Design a protein around this motif. Structure first.
Motif, short mmCIF file in Angstrom:
data_model
loop_
_atom_site.label_atom_id
_atom_site.label_comp_id
_atom_site.label_asym_id
_atom_site.label_seq_id
_atom_site.Cartn_x
_atom_site.Cartn_y
_atom_site.Cartn_z
N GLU G 171 92.07 54.48 39.51
CA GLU G 171 90.78 55.27 39.31
C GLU G 171 89.83 56.56 39.06
O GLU G 171 90.14 57.46 39.50
CB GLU G 171 89.95 55.00 40.30
N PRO G 172 88.81 56.30 37.27
CA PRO G 172 88.13 57.83 37.24
C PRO G 172 87.24 58.21 38.11
O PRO G 172 86.26 57.75 38.30
CB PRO G 172 87.31 56.77 35.83
N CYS G 176 83.54 57.33 40.06
CA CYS G 176 83.27 56.82 41.75
C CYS G 176 81.87 58.21 42.23
O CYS G 176 81.01 57.70 43.21
CB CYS G 176 84.22 57.29 42.89
HG HG Z 1 85.58 54.72 40.74
#
Ligand code: HG
Ligand code: HG
Ligand code: HG
Ligand code: HG
Ligand code: HG
Ligand code: HG
Ligand code: HG
Ligand code: HG
Ligand code: HG
Lengths: 190, 190, 198, 189, 189, 191, 198, 196, 190
Positions: G171-172, G176
């Motif tokens: 996930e980037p 987040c």
């Molecule tokens: Hg994320």
């Protein structure tokens, strides 16, 4: 004789010797503004004005002003520029062969040093000329050996390696760079 | 004559490779000692200090204070720097082994150059400059025996020598001063 | 003929900086200097034990100088100079210079030995204060011995037997400097013999 | 009792522990001008003057002085000097032997601490005395082991290793360091 | 109760964690002048004067002074000193034995923390006392396992490891020094 | 409500994560004076005065002053202190067992964290209280596997790994210290 | 009951600096942060897109202030302030926190999967300008998933056969934080609703 | 294109903005691109003359010297109406890269190649109004390749041989080429502006 | 045409390439405030004000003024903002298969770049708008090979690897970022 004030010429290559060599050790010598300062003096007529180096000659002069309780020549031209580039393999190669039981082989590499020299006017600040020059650096390794069996055994090895002294060809590079700057000056002619 | 030398810095930009610490310069920084002593021991020359000057200047301030007598200068100045260092340059070796005795020999060369420039004080022109270059020899020799009985027998002997790079600089920084005076013969400034 | 000095002389020795630019190789941290920075202590104790000389300190000056700010302030008385100066530096350090070793093995007893020597140079200068001329200077150079000796036995019975003994000694580079600087002051004083300046 | 102003004694050995330890970790403590001070305190006659440390006390004096809207003792001498050096292996050695199936072995290393102290006169700023005291530091390793076959198998190992506390070995160095300086004041005086 | 102004006590050990741990990680906590300031607070009679930290309380006081358009307590003593030294192995060792097919072994190491603590007078600026206290840090590891053949195979492993909290032991070390500093003031008094 | 100004609380642990971790990466977060400031505000009564952070607030009040060509509330107490320590293994260990052909095993380590919070009077500069608190941090790994032969072959693997949030046990610590900081004040009272 | 705001509010956010003190582990360069320094952009865009709010700049202040110096010179006109202040930091980052995976192989088809979770924390404070008191503060914390799946075949013929397929997703993390900071502005605005300050 | 005419160009600094360094084995301190711009650039404009580079590298040394002249007497200094600025925008590899090779008993042979990319930003900025007259991003590409051929054969006795050649284009030169076309294009935009 | 003063946009992602690449080399170029400026220049109407870059022109103006012993334009808006982020693998994957004796495989990695641009008014110092635009960066590898036996033996290999030039892909990101900043200036309209 013409007066040349040359202050500093810095290694701009930003390049460094690879592993195993120390990562701190520049792959190019900082001897420029010496190599240069001499190569002008050896090309005489030219009379290098120091200023390397000035704050030392300035400190001294305070004393002579003090001890007595007489002027300082300037240059009407100035030289500048820097070490442009360095790298390898550039163009490199080699061969080798082994038959029973004698082996032999040879390898070589080239490198490229570049230097930018610029004659600039003192009064007008105009750049009177600028040239970029590049020389190349050879390196070669040679080996020969014998593995032979008897039953018992036999073997032998010989080798020779030559690496051109990067400092020396900078000089040649920074020399030829002087040769150019003169040609640029002759048709001016100042 | 009275000679004032301020600083000669290591310009080689080199550092000893692995295994050596990456922080160790490949060449000693001790010039302006080597140069100061080479002038003294070659007398006539009388070194003016300036290492170092601020110390001597601090001291002269002390004397003055407790008292509540001038400072001799030089008319020429010596400058320049350590031009370059490298290896292997030219290097190589041989060796051979028969049953069961082996033997082998290797050698390396290094080079070092120095730039020494006498420059006039009064008019600040460079009087003369020299680039001098020494070389540095290293070598290793070994002999051994691998033989079987049935049990076994084996042996090894070896000797390794590296020229004291600091001492070759001494040699190098010396031969420059000689030449610098030799130009001063036909100059003469005397 | 005959020589002779007159009386004590005052020496101010400020700093002798290590110019060797050298650091111990691996496994040692790259940050450990290959040579101690302790000169201007060794040189100073040299001078005080080699009396007649009265080292004027100045290591060290600031700390004394602040300390004089203190005393003078509590009361609301001069400061001796030196007639000469000792200067100079550690010229350099290295190895292997000369080094080597031997060894041999028979069944089943092996043995071997090795040695290395390090070259230290030191430069000391006596310079006059009043006229600032350098009175004399000396380069002195020690070497540093290290050696290792090993002997062992690999033998079969059927069962087995083996043994190992070894000894390793490295001369304490610190002391060679202490010694280098010792021979350096011996010399310097001899020119003062013929000088005298006393 | 004499007043001594003890400012700084810096480690001049420029030495750092080798691998595996962090290349930033000194091979010798920097704590001198404390050890030196505790020596002088517990060695009386003497009255260590602080000055470590000074500005902390100097600031604090401003606070008192301000809250009041009363002077500060001197020392006639000064003690100075450095840690001359450290190193190892210097001298080291060891032995061992193994028979079927019991082996046993031992090793040892010696380390060297040097210390330079100097008593300098304050009033005229001349060096009164200087002392170089060097102790040594012992390290050693002891092992015993057994590899035995039955068919089945057996083995055992016992070992003990020790290095002297170079921190402490400096304390002894700096303690005798003080002794000689007192003596040079015995014959001075 | 006596007012104690204490500014800073620095880790002088010059000691750092070995590999694999980060070479930038100290071998010793920088927690002093907290561990010291809480020690004195629990050792009452005492009233630690802050000064950690002084500039925050100093800035803050401008804000109180500026809001109105009232004095600041000082101390007659001061405590100082540092963390003197750290190391290991110092004393260390261990044993173990393996028979067919059960193996077992155990090991231990000791570490050494030292502390310099000085009580100094603020008025005349003379060191009233100084003490060097030291403690040790115990670590141990125990392992046992079974390797046995059937034909198939069987194995098992249990282990336990414990390392004394160097942060705790410094508290332990910095504590007893306080006990010391108190005594020397009592017979004074 | 009491006005409490807290300036800065620094990580004093002097600790950094081991390899594989970047040697630059601090083993403990610099987040104190965030976790702290909120633990005072979220546990209110208390009113954080900022000063994180004051240099900015003062640049802003210059801007208000300029466009018009008005005071700043203070705190009667001040909180301070810092992160005392972090480490491992402290107490740690684990077990495992394998038979033909199923193996299984589990391992666990604990870490310790301590935090120093001190309430200091503003006017006299006395320290009104000081507290050291300590949490512990749990890490555990569980695995199981099967190696079996047919002749062909078969194997299987399962595993799970939990590391308690060191950042959270800092928070967990930084609260319980404030909790205790209030209790001692109940008998002061100063409130 | 019923809530209500009135008009747009002027916000000055100077710096929210990364306090995580975390750096990516090997194979990453030790120099690469494990978290972006992009807050005071993320915060500011959140305030501009969650408008009504008017980001006052001050990044950045000197570029604007140097620019105003120019205009005022070129002519030889006042500067809007903010009535609130947003501050706080990136409180942390880490891994593995909770993590795991499984897999199995039979002859000759294998398959496996692994996953990690990361935890980011963010603190956002609203502090009133005029009196300097902090009006409110939040700690929000996201998680960041990473997973990997692979499958393969080792088979014999006599000849041979093998095959490999795999997929990995991380996930980037940057986002987040943008998600973490978003939730942080929403909470704050809520308390503002019942305050109101409007 | 054309001279006229001469235009005074005072160029100060064009610095490497690629923020890129060489990989292992080469030292992590060594830049993957020359710092030689404002030499490479100053000589570019001069050989594209008419341009009269005004120095300013370099200004301080020329300034001390003017103190020397002025002091030895006990006489003006030309300015430039335009200016050039900008940077070395970016560098990388593999970008596009590839290779092949094949071996039969006992002759093998193979070859590989890689491409690098260098970008340059040049700008012509006005002096009088301090406005950007133009800015241009020009990029070159850098070729590298390795060729090898070899023989492993058995007799019983044995035979082997190897030949190889490797070339890596001079990143120094490509940048000199990039900065050159970078100047060329800059001329045209002045060719139609004109200011010249 | 509106006058826009563009000063600095700094890389805030704090990313550095992994091993083998140097630990000093950023994963993203610093060249924005060029890429942004040429974007504006080519998206004209916009008149970028320089200010890269300001002080060189400022020093230059001391020379002209003094050569004579003529004013300096402003901008009413300002572009600011930063590089929000960089990372990988983000999404990545790959497959491959081999039969006797022909093998082959293929792989891919995608990277994400994010950018924040902001237009801010000068006169009142308000942020007029801000845009976050994030592109991705494609990387793929292709291999095919043949291992076959005869007796004698045979093998072959072919491959292609491409990574997108992040420098270019930052321009792509920084370009579309100008779209939205222009667009919010359409309904402004300033
Ligand atoms: Hg994320
Ligand atoms: Hg050459
Ligand atoms: Hg020699
Ligand atoms: Hg010796
Ligand atoms: Hg001892
Ligand atoms: Hg303990
Ligand atoms: Hg927790
Ligand atoms: Hg090219
Ligand atoms: Hg792209």
């Amino acid at each position: 004789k013409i007066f040349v004030s040359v202050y500093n010429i810095q290694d701009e290559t930003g390049q460094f010797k690879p592993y195993p060599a120390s990562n701190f050790s520049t792959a190019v010598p900082q001897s420029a503004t010496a190599m240069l300062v001499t190569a002008l003096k050896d090309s005489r007529w030219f009379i290098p004005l120091e200023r390397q180096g000035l704050q030392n000659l300035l400190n001294e002069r305070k004393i002579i002003r003090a001890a007595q309780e007489q002027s300082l020549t300037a240059a009407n031209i100035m030289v500048e520029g820097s070490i442009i580039g360095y790298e390898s393999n550039v163009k490199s190669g080699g061969v080798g062969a082994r038959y029973f039981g004698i082996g032999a082989d040879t390898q070589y590499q080239l490198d490229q040093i570049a230097v930018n020299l610029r004659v600039v006017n003192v009064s007008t600040g105009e750049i009177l000329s600028s040239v970029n020059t590049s020389k190349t650096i050879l390196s070669y390794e040679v080996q020969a050996g014998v593995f032979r069996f008897i039953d018992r055994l036999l073997e032998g090895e010989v080798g020779y390696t030559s690496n051109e002294p990067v400092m020396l060809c900078l000089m040649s590079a920074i020399e030829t760079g002087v040769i150019f700057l003169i040609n640029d000056g002759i048709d001016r002619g100042l």
